[PDB]
Amino acid sequence: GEELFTGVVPILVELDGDVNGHKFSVSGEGEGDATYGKLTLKFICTTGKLPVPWPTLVTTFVQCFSRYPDHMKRHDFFKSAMPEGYVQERTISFKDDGNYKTRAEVKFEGDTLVNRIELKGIDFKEDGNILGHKLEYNYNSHNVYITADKQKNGIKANFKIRHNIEDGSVQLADHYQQNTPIGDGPVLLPDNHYLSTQSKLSKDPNEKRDHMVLLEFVTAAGITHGMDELY
Ligand SMILES: *N[C@@H](CCCCO)C(=O)O
């Protein structure tokens, strides 16, 4: 599977969502270059205005594009599941507000890596930071710890995303994530490690539709003692 990621790979993201009486769809396109852990993606809301803030969907919108160091190649579950792919399921709980439930399948369709997502939003406050669009349009860097779930033949992660709010506070979005292979081909089940992520959000000055431009870099890390010994 890792052979499929040696070059630049086109990406398609499709999300079907339902939150607070609003059905919405998002399509995203761009490319990933796993050699540098680099993602360049532009998302468009094709149904009108997005009924939740763009930053709340960044994690939902392809960790197979993470840069795994040579010394950590045996820990890359995500690429090992390719091309048949993996299911990624999350609960995202917004502190003192509602939650997202997401299920995605990530797999190749020919040369294109496709992330197809179903999202449901539950129990949000009409006046809250999410439905009230009170999040700043920016994004923090996070370290996501990955552990094996070997009886389920996959991996899991839980992590809290920090969203800056326009009132100067920071609202946490608590993520619980599980990934399972779609195919029956053996996958790599990793030792504990983490993914170091950084994301920049911007706008296309020629785009009339509601949209988000995302530039993201992800690097696997945390396995250091063996390499440190060399020096
Ligand atoms: N590279 C050092 C050893 C690192 C000490 C911790 O492993 C050296 O060559 O002396």
Author numbering: 4 to 64, 68 to 237
Give the exact sentences the study uses for this entry:
Chromophore formation of green fluorescent protein (GFP) is a built-in type of posttranslational modification, i.e., the chromophore of GFP forms by an autocatalytic reaction of the backbone involving cyclization, oxidation, and dehydration reactions. For recombinant expression and purification of green fluorescent protein (GFP), one of the variants of GFP, GFPuv, was used in this study. Here, we demonstrated that the second posttranslational modification is generated at the side chain of the C-terminal Lys238 residue of the GFPuv, a mutant of GFP, when over-expressed in E. coli BL21 (DE3) pLysS strain. We determined the crystal structures of GFPuv form I and form II at 1.65 Å and 1.28 Å resolution, respectively.
Furthermore, the mass spectrum of the H231GMDELYK238 fragment ions from GFPuv form II was also better matched to the theoretical mass spectrum of the fragment containing the Lys238 converted to 6-hydroxynorleucine, in terms of the isotope pattern of ions. The results of the mass spectrometric analysis, described above, indicated that the mass increase of ~1 Da in GFPuv form II is most likely caused by the conversion of an amino group into a hydroxyl group occurred in the side chain of Lys238 residue at the C terminus. The mass spectrometric data supports that the conversion of an amino group into a hydroxyl group occurs in the ε-amino group of the Lys238 residue. This modification causes a decrease in the net charge of the modified form of GFPuv (named form II) from that of the unmodified GFPuv (form I) at the neutral pH. In addition, the charge difference occurs on the molecular surface, not the interior of the β-barrel structure, because the Lys238 residue locates on the solvent accessible α-helix. The C-terminal α-helices of GFPuv form I and form II also show almost the same structure in each other, except for the slight differences in the side chains of the C-terminal residue and the adjacent Glu235, where the electron densities at the end of the substituent groups in form II are more disordered than those in form I. The overall structures of GFPuv form I and form II are almost identical when these are superposed, showing 0.145 Å rmsd for Cα atoms of 233 residues, though slight differences arise mainly in the conformations of the turns consisting of Asn23–Gly24 and Asp155–Lys158. The regions around the chromophore of both forms show almost the same structure, although the alternative conformers of the side chains of His148 and Thr203 could be modeled in GFPuv form I and form II, respectively. The fluorescent properties, the overall structure as well as the structure in the vicinity of chromophore are almost the same in GFPuv form I and form II, although their chemical composition at the C-termini is different. These seem to be due to the fact that the modification site is ~30 Å away from the chromophore.
